[PDB]
Design a protein around this ligand. Structure first.
Ligand SMILES: N[C@@H](CCC(=O)N[C@@H](CS)C(=O)NCC(=O)O)C(=O)O
Ligand SMILES: N[C@@H](CCC(=O)N[C@@H](CS)C(=O)NCC(=O)O)C(=O)O
Ligand SMILES: [Mg+2]
Ligand SMILES: [Mg+2]
Lengths: 210, 210
């Protein structure tokens, strides 16, 4: 089986878990104790040299960066499970919205999740000033999404693709925060969020969040 | 021909130009006047709804995000020009180092380029403190690169790939700044920078910069 080295409470690990479940790929989770700094020790730093989770080993291949592992699973196991790709030249528009997720959505979203979800469990107060200004940026991104999702059922096409999937971990995390209002207030975004978070493969990830 | 809507002074536009020249794809530049704010006007905001450059139109396909356009060009025109992919499972490691470029390198490299190259052009001041701090961050990234490039001639394989190519615009821009020392002091990184910036396709990009 594919071996996924990370943590169930890591959003970036969650991203890969989602793909693995969509693609029905056999795998085992190898736990990395983040509090203990294992992600900064050996062997984990031999699998991800930046000292981050997740990494993965599949046969003779070792991989890191969640979106790379995700895309690798979706290609390598394409014939199994959910079809996360598109026909013909549709792949190009999946690339576009994958890169929107990486470069437009994620910087703001991740920061919001750090400030509101992770920092509190470590006893650190949320930087509300940073949250406010970061929500401005994210609202502007989601206004673009609201327009897109008025024309297309999902971001890259009228079907669920990896472009949508890569959004799941931070969108889920934000639903548990006052940033949920950014999603609720945009009616196509809201329904799209309901659609992606309601998927069975994502429910399997959520099962793993105590 | 492919229409590339952007500016040669834009690093993200340069990233696409590099792939277009490597792949020997006929294209025409459609200049977008950033100083006049055309990237925030129609029709450009119908091509890139985030009001950024570049965007591209290839026949009936419209695309934005430089790395999406770039990877589209490399796949769609794979048989032409330089081979930017790898055989077998090698694609997976290309994805890894593409994502490293997007998530590990680009944030601090882009910030250094903004502070030292773009602000001076404008009427904004170079924040020396933030430059120092951000050089610490980039230096640590490039320490990982040095280790990688000690084992592999290029980042994803022993051959030039899109993972390398996507670094060109910000690396070139930093060579014209004192951040050049971060590359000069790391010998495998230095030779790799020499190897990629010395390519004919990159020279064709630089030829467009007055
Ligand atoms: N861009 C990477 C980021 C991975 C990442 O930041 N993971 C977090 C856990 S969610 C981590 O390991 N943080 C520890 C650190 O940065 O030192 C990916 O997508 O895999
Ligand atoms: N992630 C995007 C970034 C594009 C980008 O930021 N372009 C700059 C010029 S290099 C821009 O258009 N700036 C105007 C703005 O952000 O308002 C890409 O790779 O294409
Ligand atoms: Mg509607
Ligand atoms: Mg050596």
């Amino acid at each position: 089986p594919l071996k996924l080295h990370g943590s169930v409470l890591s959003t970036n690990t969650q991203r890969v878990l989602a793909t693995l479940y969509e693609k029905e790929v056999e795998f085992e989770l190898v736990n990395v104790n983040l509090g203990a700094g294992e992600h900064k020790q050996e062997p984990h730093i031999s699998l991800n040299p930046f000292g981050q989770v997740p990494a993965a080993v599949d046969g003779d291949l070792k991989l890191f960066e969640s979106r790379a592992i995700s895309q690798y699973v979706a290609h390598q196991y394409a014939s199994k499970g959910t079809q996360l790709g598109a026909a013909g030249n549709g792949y190009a528009t999946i690339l576009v919205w994958q890169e929107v997720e990486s470069h437009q959505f994620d910087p703001s979203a991740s920061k919001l999740v750090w400030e509101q979800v992770f920092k509190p469990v470590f006893g650190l107060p949320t930087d509300a000033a940073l949250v406010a200004e970061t929500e401005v940026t994210l609202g502007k991104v989601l206004d673009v999404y609201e327009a897109r999702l008025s024309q297309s059922k999902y971001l890259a096409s009228d079907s669920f693709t990896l472009a949508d999937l890569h959004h799941l971990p931070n969108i889920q995390a934000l639903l548990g925060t006052p940033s949920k209002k950014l999603f609720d207030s945009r009616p196509h975004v809201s329904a799209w969020v309901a659609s992606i978070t309601g998927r069975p493969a994502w429910g399997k990830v959520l099962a793993l969040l105590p």
